[PDB]
Amino acid sequence: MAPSRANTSVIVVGGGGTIGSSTALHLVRSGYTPSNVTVLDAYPIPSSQSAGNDLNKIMGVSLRNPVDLQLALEARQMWNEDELFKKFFHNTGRLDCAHGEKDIADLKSGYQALVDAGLDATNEWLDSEDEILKRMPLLSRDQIKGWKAIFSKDGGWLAAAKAINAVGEYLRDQGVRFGFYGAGSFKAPLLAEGVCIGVETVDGTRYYADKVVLAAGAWSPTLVELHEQCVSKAWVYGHIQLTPEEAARYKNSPVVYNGDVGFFFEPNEHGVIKVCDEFPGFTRFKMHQPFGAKAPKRISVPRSHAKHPTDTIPDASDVSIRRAIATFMPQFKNKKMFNQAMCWCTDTADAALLICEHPEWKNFVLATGDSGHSFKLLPNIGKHVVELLEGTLADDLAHAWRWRPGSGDALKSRRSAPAKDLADMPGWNHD
Numbered sequence: 001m002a003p004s005r006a007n008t009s010v011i012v013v014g015g016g017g018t019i020g021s022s023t024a025l026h027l028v029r030s031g032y033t034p035s036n037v038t039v040l041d042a043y044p045i046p047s048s049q050s051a052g053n054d055l056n057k058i059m060g061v062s063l064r065n066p067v068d069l070q071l072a073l074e075a076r077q078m079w080n081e082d083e084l085f086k087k088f089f090h091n092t093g094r095l096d097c098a099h100g101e102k103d104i105a106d107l108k109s110g111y112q113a114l115v116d117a118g119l120d121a122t123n124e125w126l127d128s129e130d131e132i133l134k135r136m137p138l139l140s141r142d143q144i145k146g147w148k149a150i151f152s153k154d155g156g157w158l159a160a161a162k163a164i165n166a167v168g169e170y171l172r173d174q175g176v177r178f179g180f181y182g183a184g185s186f187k188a189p190l191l192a193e194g195v196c197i198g199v200e201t202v203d204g205t206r207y208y209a210d211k212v213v214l215a216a217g218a219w220s221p222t223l224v225e226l227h228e229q230c231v232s233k234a235w236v237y238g239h240i241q242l243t244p245e246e247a248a249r250y251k252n253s254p255v256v257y258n259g260d261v262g263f264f265f266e267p268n269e270h271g272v273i274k275v276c277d278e279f280p281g282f283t284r285f286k287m288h289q290p291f292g293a294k295a296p297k298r299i300s301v302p303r304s305h306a307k308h309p310t311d312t313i314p315d316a317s318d319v320s321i322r323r324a325i326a327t328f329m330p331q332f333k334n335k336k337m338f339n340q341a342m343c344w345c346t347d348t349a350d351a352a353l354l355i356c357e358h359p360e361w362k363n364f365v366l367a368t369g370d371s372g373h374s375f376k377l378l379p380n381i382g383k384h385v386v387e388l389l390e391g392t393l394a395d396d397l398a399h400a401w402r403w404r405p406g407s408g409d410a411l412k413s414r415r416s417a418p419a420k421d422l423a424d425m426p427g428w429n430h431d
């Protein structure tokens with residue numbers, strides 16, 4: 001008979017990242033014995049190459065699939081109420097802006113979706129630049145002519161790296177096992193009679209456990225064969241440095257986002273503003289054999305800034321981010337960004353997660369397909385990964401997250417175009 005929860009060992013591969021750390025946290029909260037939980041990652045939590053290892057991420061409700069509502073409301077509750085997470089949510093609001101006929105129309109129906117989901121109380125439609133300027137006076141009336149926006153009072157930003165670090169300190173304090181670098185870089189599951197019984201890492205270390213969760217983010221489809229269910233893509237950011245006096249003016253600013261321009265956050269405690277552009281992401285295709293492939297594979301394999309710290313971003317991305325600064329912060333349009341880097345996610349065709357047992361390898365569970373929208377789910381997502389492990393996952397979540405090679409084209413996903421490839425986007429490589 002299977003061991004009880006208290007005696008069930010679980011390896012979380014990618015446990016130094018977002019979904020992995022959340023899964024480990026929820027194993028412990030659910031009453032798995034901490035010393036039976038092993039967190040393996042290529043890098044110490046929060047992993048240097050985790051998409052969650054950043055200054056900030058946006059918190060808000062965005063409804064791309066039906067399950068998104070439950071998941072966002074769960075996350076919102078915990079960012080507000082959970083003592084582990086609360087201090088890292090800054091509830092400054094989110095300004096979701098659009099300009100142009102198409103983008104405005106899409107935003108208007110998006111607003112109605114929020115209303116229809118029951119969130120009328122915390123979302124307001126701003127129908128002119130004058131209304132936007134009321135919610136953030138530091139935007140330039142010259143740059144935002146003809147813009148409209150949704151203002152979400154319940155949104156804001158998340159101190160992402162700090163939050164994962166706090167989870168790591170919880171796990172450490174509880175007695176969770178850690179393996180990093182050579183001792184944490186997964187290469188293969190260990191299989192016996194079609195059951196997964198552990199993993200082996202690049203340095204030959206073998207870990208044995210009753211269950212294994214693969215929460216390896218953008219690396220997931222590089223590590224095991226996923227039949228193009230997830231296609232990994234990079235997005236980009238840069239940092240600019242403000243004087244203390246400049247930074248003080250921006251204190252408690254709402255997050256500002258425009259799907260056609262990018263987004264930016266208030267300065268952190270060091271006076272640094274992080275800026276992203278917005279675009280369909282970049283692949284980096286190369287020949288690579290994930291465990292379980294039965295033919296030659298060309299797949300998008302992350303070019304990791306952690307492994308290649310002299311990398312920056314494509315020239316085109318430097319241009320686009322600078323255009324975002326010129327639009328959002330014209331007074332800063334001549335600052336030189338630094339710490340430019342690529343940040344990796346993996347898209348499913350429908351932008352819902354991939355959280356399911358492997359169809360052949362019993363007790364090996366996928367927990368990936370983050371689709372560029374999942375940091376905000378740090379507090380809660382692990383709860384549902386545990387439910388999946390235990391066979392108690394609700395039908396709607398399980399269906400949305402199921403193994404689905406048939407589902408569609410992840411290279412385009414729900415985005416405006418198929419991602420371009422870093423091979424065709426010069427300027428990031430300084431080898």
Ligand SMILES: *Cc1cc2c(cc1C)nc1c(=O)[nH]c(=O)nc-1n2C[C@H](O)[C@H](O)[C@H](O)COP(=O)(O)OP(=O)(O)OC[C@H]1O[C@@H](n2cnc3c(N)ncnc32)[C@H](O)[C@@H]1O
Nearest residue numbers: 014017018019047050051058186216217343372374375376
């Ligand atoms: C890139 C990005 C993403 C992003 C964003 C802006 C950028 C530039 N803005 C967001 C926002 O405003 N709000 C939001 O909610 N999300 C936003 N995103 C997306 C978000 O960052 C991601 O969706 C999410 O963080 C991904 O979580 P996931 O757990 O899937 O991925 P990860 O945190 O990168 O963790 C993966 C871990 O796996 C480890 N790894 C890799 N290979 C191995 C091996 N071989 N063995 C063991 N571990 C491995 C990595 O080290 C990593 O820690």
